[PDB]
């Protein structure tokens, strides 16, 4: 993936992993693996994705299953800007 880097950078800022964002890969988990990935915190990272990639993820494709792994976010945003 391309965008996995900028996604983990975003979550490493918002959820404040700092360096821990940079030791996890695409096939690595976010929801459950990150202790900071919580209720208003998922809202916050979605908003941040919209900002940096200058797009909007559709409501009917944003799920808990979207934040399962870094590769999931990377794939979704790479489908958006391509389609």
Residues present in the chain in total: 83
What domains can be seen in the chain, in order of their start residue?
1-83 (1.10.1200.10)
Tokens for 20?
């821990």
Secondary structure of residue 48 in the 3-state scheme: helix
Q: What is the DSSP letter of 63?
A: -
Residues of 52-71 as b/e, b for ≥16 C-beta within 10 angstroms?
A: ebeeebeeeeeeeebbebbb
Tokens for 10?
């975003």
Rounded Cα–Cα distance for residues 53 and 49 (Å): 6
Which experiment gave this structure? NMR
**Cβ atoms of residues 21 and 11 within 8 Å:** yes
Secondary structure of residue 60 in the 3-state scheme: helix
Torsion, Cα 39 36 67 5, to 10 degrees, reads 140
Q: Which residues pair with 34 in a beta bridge?
A: 31
Residue 3 sits at the vertex; the CA angle it makes with 17 and 80, to the nearest 5 degrees, is 125
Rounded Cα–Cα distance for residues 47 and 27 (Å): 23
């Amino acid at each position: 993936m391309q965008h996995l880097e900028a996604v983990r950078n975003i979550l490493g800022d918002v959820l404040n992993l700092g360096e821990r964002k940079h030791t996890l890969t695409a096939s690595s988990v976010l929801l459950g693996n990150i202790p900071e990935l919580d209720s208003m915190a998922v809202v916050n990272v979605i908003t941040a994705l919209e900002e940096y990639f200058d797009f909007s993820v559709d409501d009917d494709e944003i799920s808990a299953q979207t934040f399962e792994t870094l590769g999931s976010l990377a794939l979704f945003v790479e489908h958006k800007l391509s389609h």
